Amino acid sequence: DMYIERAGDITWEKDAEVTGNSPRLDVALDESGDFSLVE
Amino acid sequence: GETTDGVYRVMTRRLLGSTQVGVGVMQEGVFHTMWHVTKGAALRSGEGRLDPYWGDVKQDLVSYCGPWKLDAAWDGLSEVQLLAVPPGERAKNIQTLPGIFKTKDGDIGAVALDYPAGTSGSPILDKCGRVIGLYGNGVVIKNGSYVSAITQGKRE
Ligand SMILES: O=C(Nc1ccc2c(c1)CNC2)c1cccc2[nH]cnc12
Numbered sequence: 001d002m003y004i005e006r007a008g009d010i011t012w013e014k015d016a017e018v019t020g021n022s023p024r025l026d027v028a029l030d031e032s033g034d035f036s037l038v039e
Numbered sequence: 040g041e042t043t044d045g046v047y048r049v050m051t052r053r054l055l056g057s058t059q060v061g062v063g064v065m066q067e068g069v070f071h072t073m074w075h076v077t078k079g080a081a082l083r084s085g086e087g088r089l090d091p092y093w094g095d096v097k098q099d100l101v102s103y104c105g106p107w108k109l110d111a112a113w114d115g116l117s118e119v120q121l122l123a124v125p126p127g128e129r130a131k132n133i134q135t136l137p138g139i140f141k142t143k144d145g146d147i148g149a150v151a152l153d154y155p156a157g158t159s160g161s162p163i164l165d166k167c168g169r170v171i172g173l174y175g176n177g178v179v180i181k182n183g184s185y186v187s188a189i190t191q192g193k194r195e
Contacts, residue, residue, distance in 0.1 A: 002060070003083040004047040008130035010064065012120055012168045020135035020151045023186060027140045027178055033074065033099040035140070035178040035188065 040085030042068055042104075046124055046162060049076050059126035062160035064170055070103035072160040073175045073190070077101060099176040100192045110194035111169035113137060113148040119189070120164045121150055121174055126157040132164075140177075140188050148189035150174060163189050 026038040042065060049061040049072060061076030070082065070089055074096055082089040082103060094101035102108075113119060121133045137148040148171075150163060159175025172189035180186055 001053065001083060002049060002051050002077060002080060004041075004049060004063065004070065004089070006041060006043065007046045007048050007062070007124045008122075009045050010122060010162060010164065010168055010170060012164055012166055013132040016120060016132040016134045018118070018134040020133070022136045022138040023149070023151055023180070024139045024141065025149065025178065025180070025186065027142055029097070029142060029144075031097060033095075033097045033176065035176065037178055037180070 040087035042084070046122055046130060048124055049082070049160060059157040061157060061175070062124040064109065064160075064162050064173070066170070067105070067108045069105040069108050071107060071109055071173065071192070072101055072103075073173055074099045074101045075175070076159050098192065099190060100173070102192070106195050107192035108194060109170045109172075109192055111165055111167075111171045112191060113163075113165070113171045113189050115148070117166065119148075119150065119171065121152050122162050122164060123152070123154055123158055123174070124161050126155055137189060138186065148172070149177060149186050150189060151184070151186045153184045
């Protein structure tokens with residue numbers, strides 16, 4: 001049995017850690033809601 | 040129970056100790072999370088109970104207490120913030136420029152940040168603090184890393 005606990009406010013924070021790249025990927029979405037790589 | 044707006048952890052005591060299986064957004068009295076986090080099961084909020092209202096396995100989304108309320112969209116140009124809520128760790132904002140998932144039915148924004156599976160449901164925000172989608176449904180690239188879509192529901 002599942003339960004919820006508050007973790008914080010939803011706010012934009014100035015000067016946050018800027019990381020991660022921006023890749024363009026060819027994907028397919030199936031009926032089970034799972035993505036896969038199309039190549 | 041607690042229905043204040045904000046980000047929340049989704050916990051379970053069924054396994055060893057207390058385990059974080061996901062995260063969610065409380066907005067306008069509705070709890071929003073990813074389908075694979077809860078499988079549509081009822082949730083507990085203190086003494087209160089949250090019952091599922093809408094859900095879809097293909098979109099991988101589910102809402103509790105009412106219809107899906109989140110309807111902001113990524114503008115296709117600006118940086119966003121993943122408000123990551125990792126298991127056992129403090130909520131933390133991570134700024135990134137999203138990539139693109141190209142599909143046969145159009146393009147979707149995608150954030151390339153690798154977090155544990157228990158981080159699923161963590162909101163992705165625009166500069167106004169509005170939730171433009173949830174993190175936790177994507178793909179595993181050649182590197183072994185995870186790249187999640189910016190998954191957004193429909194506000195009826
Ligand atoms: O596996 C993940 N997500 C997921 C699981 C089950 C299902 C779906 C998505 C959609 N259909 C059912 C995941 C989420 C977040 C970070 C991750 N790192 C490695 N895998 C993940």
